[PDB]
């Protein structure tokens, strides 16, 4: 068990901060948000996306393959 | 030995507490009320009579 | 089969009616507490 | 002498240090690296200016990546200005736990 | 002094919920715990209130779970609320596990140890509920899951015989795992008491895989209704489930009674179970497909060892994040497979699929790591 | 924890003895404070740029005497109770609660 | 790394503990034989042969 006063030394920081009372919950929540998001799925699409395509291109050849394979044409 | 607790500084503080005591009486009836759906003080509240017949 | 199913879907109706108020105002009270921390200013201020 | 085949070598350093984006925080390095023992000891041994530093440098990374947020471009730290700064400290404390283990072996 | 720092029994509840320093910096990704912890109050409310109307005979269990979902008033929801919360379960303890991997939360080694315990254990839970209510993938998968033990050489037959109580599957197995049902998730609450006292050793780790000594806020107000939070969307999500689609997940074979004579001809388990299933029928062997299938499982405990980086996180690793992935799609994949018939296609990317899993994990991930750290000069 | 308790204290629940003795303090101050030249002249040129009389020692007694237990915790109550505080730290401040928490310590859930 | 572990010191203290460890062995394996009622090993026996036919 870790305590407040005990954690590690830190010098020479300040930290300003503002009650939740002085200030606004959502600031700038659309027009800061959506730019950030849009950041944040830039920087993960090449590392997220590409095992997912090749999961879903697998999964359409593959039901494709089998559908097609339980049909005749000659006896 | 609850002799201790008399005299005119502890009746004092009985007297600034008695309004919230009373207050959180007035929450805990209401809310008992409102819990059970109570019958007899629900019929009363001349809206919610959302029984009728 | 299911004679659940028209109370299941007037409940159904209830629960989104209530999470539509419920989620946008969780969501306003969390952004409150967090708002100290979320525009929470920092200075470093090392001797020379 | 080693001209253009280490170029290329530290192109791919450059590279990767961009991608891993510790840098888009003002993070070093040595600021990221694992706490184990050797490098506990190696933070323990630091002195005065860069401990403080390297707090700060951490705080301003945790404060940015609970806001989600990154360093404008101008404050990344360069690859070229990357300093090894607990490399000797930990390379030490490394040297020394390895003496005590072939003292332990005979 | 305060009553809540010093109180013998309020100390506990200071120390875990209040006062608790927990890094500033810490995602959604971590509200999954809580969740876990909501998922088992949840299963044990909605059990007891199901366990008050069940009957444990063969001749009666189907009768009784249909009683709960006519009969008894608002049976239907905690019996819903139940099946579905198993989902939930399930969905929360893989967002969980997951996270331990990409954020290298894993070198908390009796933290995460105690972890694949209490995953064996809801595993256990799960399967034996789902026997209980006796249609025919209760009775199969029964069949099937117990089975698994027969493949165990020398004394495996006897072992199997020992936990149907008799030849097959019957009268004293079902009573049996009602019973064990009953105890186990009280015992999973008290592995999960021994997983937060382990964890409170060293604090949470987050994101960035560093130290957060420096940046740490106090667990109420800030993670207290940050879970409130996350509580409301995993009470949502059961919603929708128990009140818009409450057979989306289940069988259609469950509603048929238990035939002890005739098999379904298709055969598959609940979604949560899809990638281990797939794992088993790789193998053209009956000891080489369980023991790949307990291997699937088992394999969380070796993680540890196969830390290899010298940065605890996957957030500044590009190379390991596309392996990362790579696994996720990979279980994708082994689910998908899971859910189908053993036919052309599907056995050999099956295969394929199954030595990915294993290929990512012991090899492929453990590769990365000493690469990026070549590239690094570290 | 300790100081804040004692706002909300009197705040909710001021009893009389307690403000006789504050009452009591300021009196004392005022007397012992208003002793020499220096004190005193201080006094009137601070006095006759804010309020600009001299307020004379007999009004100051009129003012700390109207003073009891309902004067104090409504007096109390308009400048602490449910109020947003302004907080300085300086020095090993770890322990230093949170905003939050101080900001909770500024009413009480009982009341 | 546990190359740590390779030296004249380690292989002393297996040398140490290796009688210790196969009466542990020992212990383990006719604690089984005697809780399971084993059969392939308590048929050969020489008194405990309480099956007969
Ligand atoms: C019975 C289901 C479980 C419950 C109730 C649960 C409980 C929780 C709680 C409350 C947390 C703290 C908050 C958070 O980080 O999420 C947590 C953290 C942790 N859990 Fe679990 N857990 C369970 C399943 C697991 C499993 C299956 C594993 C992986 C084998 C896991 C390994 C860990 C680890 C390593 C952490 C540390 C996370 C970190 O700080 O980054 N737990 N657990
Ligand atoms: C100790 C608290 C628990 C009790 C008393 C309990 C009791 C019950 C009972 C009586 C049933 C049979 C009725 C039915 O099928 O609807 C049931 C089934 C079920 N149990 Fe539990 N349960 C508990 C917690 C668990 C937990 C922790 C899990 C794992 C998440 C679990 C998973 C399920 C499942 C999957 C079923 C089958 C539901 C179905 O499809 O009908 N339960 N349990
Ligand atoms: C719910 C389930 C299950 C839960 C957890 C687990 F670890 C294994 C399981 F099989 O129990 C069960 O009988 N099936 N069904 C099943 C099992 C094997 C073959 C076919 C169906 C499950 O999916």
Avoid at chain 1, 26 to 33: L, Q
Avoid at chain 5, 104 to 113: A, C, D, I, K, R
Avoid at chain 5, 266 to 295: D, Q, T
């Amino acid at each position: 068990g870790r305590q407040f006063g005990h954690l590690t030394r830190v010098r020479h920081v300040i930290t300003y901060s503002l009650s939740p009372f002085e200030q606004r919950a959502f600031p700038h929540y659309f027009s800061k948000g959506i730019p950030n998001v849009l950041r944040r799925t830039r920087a993960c699409i090449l590392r997220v996306a590409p095992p997912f395509v090749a999961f879903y291109l697998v999964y359409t050849w593959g039901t494709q393959e089998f559908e097609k394979s339980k049909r005749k044409n000659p006896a | 030995m609850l002799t201790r607790f008399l005299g005119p500084r502890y009746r004092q503080l009985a007297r600034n507490w008695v309004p919230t005591a009373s207050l959180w009486g007035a929450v805990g009836a209401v809310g008992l009320v409102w819990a059970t759906d109570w019958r007899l003080i629900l019929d009363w509240v001349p809206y919610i009579n959302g029984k009728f017949k | 089969a299911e004679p659940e199913h028209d109370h299941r879907k007037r409940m159904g109706l209830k629960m989104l009616l209530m999470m539509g108020l419920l989620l946008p105002l969780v969501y306003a009270m969390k952004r409150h507490k967090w708002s100290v921390l979320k525009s929470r200013k920092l200075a470093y201020r090392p001797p020379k | 002498a080693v001209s253009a085949s280490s170029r290329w070598l530290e192109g791919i350093r450059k590279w990767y240090y961009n991608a891993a984006g510790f840098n888009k925080l003002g993070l070093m390095r040595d600021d990221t690296i694992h706490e184990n023992d050797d490098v506990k000891e190696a933070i323990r041994r630091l002195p005065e200016n860069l401990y403080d530093d390297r707090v700060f440098r951490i705080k301003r990374a945790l404060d940015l990546s609970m806001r989600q947020q990154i360093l404008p471009k101008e404050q990344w730290t360069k690859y070229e200005e990357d300093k090894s700064y607990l490399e000797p400290y930990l390379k030490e404390v490394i040297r020394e736990r390895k003496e005590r283990e072939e003292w332990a072996k005979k | 002094t305060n009553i809540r720092k010093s109180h013998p029994l309020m100390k506990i509840v200071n120390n875990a919920f209040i006062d608790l320093p927990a890094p500033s910096n810490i995602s959604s990704w971590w509200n999954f715990g809580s969740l876990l912890g909501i998922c088992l109050i949840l299963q044990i409310l909605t059990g007891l209130f199901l366990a008050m109307h069940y009957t444990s005979d063969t001749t009666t269990a189907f009768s009784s779970v249909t009683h709960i979902c006519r009969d008894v008033n608002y049976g239907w929801i905690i019996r819903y609320m139940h099946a579905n919360g198993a989902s939930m379960f399930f969905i929360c303890l893989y967002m969980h596990v997951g996270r331990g991997l990409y954020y290298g939360s894993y070198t908390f080694l009796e933290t995460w140890n105690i972890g694949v315990i209490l995953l064996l254990t809801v595993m256990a839970t799960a399967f034996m509920g789902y026997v209980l209510p006796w249609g025919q993938m209760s009775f199969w998968g029964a069949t099937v899951i117990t089975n698994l033990l027969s493949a165990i050489p020398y004394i495996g037959t006897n072992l199997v015989e020992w936990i149907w109580g008799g030849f097959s599957v019957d009268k004293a197995t079902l009573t049996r795992f009602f019973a064990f049902h009953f105890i186990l998730p009280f015992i999973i609450m008290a592995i999960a008491m021994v997983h937060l006292l382990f964890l409170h050793e060293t604090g949470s780790n987050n994101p960035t895989g560093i130290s957060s000594d420096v940046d740490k806020i106090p667990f109420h107000p800030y993670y207290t209704i940050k879970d409130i939070l996350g509580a409301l969307l995993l009470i949502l999500a059961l919603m929708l489930l128990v009140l818009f689609a409450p057979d989306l997940l289940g069988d259609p074979d469950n509603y048929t009674p238990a035939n002890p004579l005739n098999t379904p001809p298709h055969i598959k388990p609940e979604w949560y179970f899809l990638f281990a299933y797939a794992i088993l029928r790789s193998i053209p062997n009956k000891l080489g497909g369980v023991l790949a299938l307990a291997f699937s499982i088992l394999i969380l405990a070796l993680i540890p060892l196969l830390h290899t980086s010298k940065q605890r996180s996957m957030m500044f690793r590009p190379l390991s994040q596309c392996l990362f992935w790579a696994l996720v799609a990979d279980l994708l994949t082994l689910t998908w497979i899971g859910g189908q018939p053993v036919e052309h296609p599907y056995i050999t990317i099956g295969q394929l699929a199954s030595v990915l899993y294993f290929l990512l994990i012991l090899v492929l991930m453990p590769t990365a790591g000493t690469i990026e750290n070549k590239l690094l000069k570290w | 924890f300790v100081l804040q308790g004692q706002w909300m204290r009197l705040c909710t629940s001021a009893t009389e003895s307690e403000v006789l003795r504050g009452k009591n303090l300021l009196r004392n101050a005022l007397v012992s404070h208003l002793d020499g030249t220096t004190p005193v002249c201080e006094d009137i040129g601070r006095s006759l740029l804010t309020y600009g009389r001299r307020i004379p020692l007999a009004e100051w007694e009129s003012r700390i005497a109207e003073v009891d237990a309902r004067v104090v915790r409504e007096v109390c109550s308009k400048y602490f109770y449910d109020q947003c505080p302004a907080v300085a730290g300086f020095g090993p401040i770890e322990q230093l609660p949170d905003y939050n928490r101080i900001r909770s310590g500024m009413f009480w859930l009982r009341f």
